Design a protein around this ligand. Structure first.
Ligand SMILES: O=C(COc1ccccc1P(=O)(O)O)Nc1cc(Cl)cc(Cl)c1
Ligand SMILES: O=C(COc1ccccc1P(=O)(O)O)Nc1cc(Cl)cc(Cl)c1
Ligand SMILES: [Cl-]
Ligand SMILES: [Cl-]
Ligand SMILES: [Cl-]
Ligand SMILES: [Cl-]
Ligand SMILES: [Mg+2]
Ligand SMILES: [Mg+2]
Ligand SMILES: [Mg+2]
Ligand SMILES: [Mg+2]
Ligand SMILES: [Mg+2]
Ligand SMILES: [Mg+2]
Lengths: 228, 228
């Protein structure tokens, strides 16, 4: 439905929708921009991520409330409504994963873009995994793992340990290990090594870069405190 | 789309959607319940009002952000997106007004139901008026006025001055006078008389009723403080 709108107008309206807290609109505008076929700049990648993270975050919060009610109840209504919300969440994840596969990742040649999109691929398979059951589930978990792992391998070769995209990727992969893969030791090890290697590289940063990096390091610290 | 779902299942799912903070879903479930054609109980009227007030409240907050940006800017993008949000807001108001006209109000014979629905009719024409311009606008303002006035006339004849529906109606009609009708003296007079008449009737209430009434009286007081 965004085929007739200029790319620049889609980006401008995504920024307006963000100000208005209209995240579903923001995501639809950014989906339209991606579908223009041109690569995304740093700022535009961030708009894409913010939009979908807010949309899926609403769905995940709702699914958790409903799952909790359902588990306490164990008529068909709670299960039906939890399934409705689940299906819509799955649709959003499939949409994002589709944008990454068609064709964001394959055109992304710089480290900052390729790591960003592979992290997103890990995150959206992780959201699918949160609602998945059984073994169908195992392949979903492995897709998240594989994406995160490719992102980590590139990040370690191509970016400094304080790079905020590298830090956010490690943060999220540590959450994947703790919450999805039942590997809390791997989670803690990854968060600790990431934190320590970033701390040792802070001396190289400007005031503003230091602020960006230390913000995510605090998130790593908050998790370590929760987990230990 | 809710034609195939049981009335009771629609009500149950509206309550679930409220817990999950899924207000668009909650409104769609309550629209389905209304369209079953049976009158609504006290609790169900309140579910209907909560659902739509949250949906339209999101739209109004967004429209205000966009209108502000537009007015500061004065390409077509800000105006286009503000119009998109405005049109969707208008659609929600028209939907609620349609449910009231077909056929909630005409079947509502008790004071508590008839006052509730006429207040809602006032509120949704008021939301239309907030975005309306010119004289088309005058007829919208008069529709809000007329609805509120009929509600007030019934409320004064049929309910005690501490009744929370009567209090909320007067609160909202005072806001209509202050913000829409450019009648801040009428707003202040109405809020003051309502507050004073409720205060004099508090002695008749149980602890729980006193709590319900004084909560809305505080809202009247907060407005008087803002306005004087
Ligand atoms: O509360 C959280 C914490 O999740 C973290 C924490 C550190 C890194 C990454 C995440 P995630 O990508 O799971 O949101 N996530 C969350 C956010 C929203 Cl908007 C909804 C829900 Cl249900 C969970
Ligand atoms: O901030 C307010 C205050 O409005 C009042 C105050 C007293 C009585 C009635 C109302 P209203 O029906 O205008 O929301 N309303 C408001 C609520 C949301 Cl969710 C969004 C927006 Cl933009 C305004
Ligand atoms: Cl459902
Ligand atoms: Cl490439
Ligand atoms: Cl638009
Ligand atoms: Cl009647
Ligand atoms: Mg073009
Ligand atoms: Mg399912
Ligand atoms: Mg390229
Ligand atoms: Mg039936
Ligand atoms: Mg218009
Ligand atoms: Mg009747």
């Amino acid at each position: 439905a965004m085929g007739s709108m200029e790319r620049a107008s889609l980006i401008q309206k995504a920024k307006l929708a963000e100000q208005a807290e209209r995240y579903e609109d923001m995501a639809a505008f950014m989906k339209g921009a991606v579908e223009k076929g041109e690569e995304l700049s740093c700022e535009e990648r961030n708009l894409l991520s913010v939009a979908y993270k807010n949309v899926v975050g609403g769905q995940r919060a709702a699914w958790r409330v409903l799952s909790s009610i359902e588990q306490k109840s164990n008529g068909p209504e709670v299960r039906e409504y939890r399934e409705k919300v689940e299906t819509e969440l799955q649709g959003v994840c499939d949409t994002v994963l589709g944008l990454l596969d068609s064709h964001l990742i394959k055109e992304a040649g710089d480290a900052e873009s390729r790591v960003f999109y592979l992290k997103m691929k890990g995150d959206y398979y992780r959201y699918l995994a949160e609602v998945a059951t059984g073994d169908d589930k195992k392949r979903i978990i492995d897709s998240a793992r594989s994406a995160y792992q490719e992102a980590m391998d590139i990040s370690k070769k191509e970016m400094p340990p304080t790079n905020p995209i590298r830090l956010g990727l490690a943060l999220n992969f540590s959450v994947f290990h703790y919450e999805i893969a039942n590997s809390p030791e791997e989670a803690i090890s990854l968060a600790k090594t990431t934190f320590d290697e970033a701390m040792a590289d802070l001396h190289t940063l400007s005031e503003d870069s230091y602020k960006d990096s230390t913000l995510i390091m605090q998130l790593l610290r908050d998790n370590l405190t929760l987990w230990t």
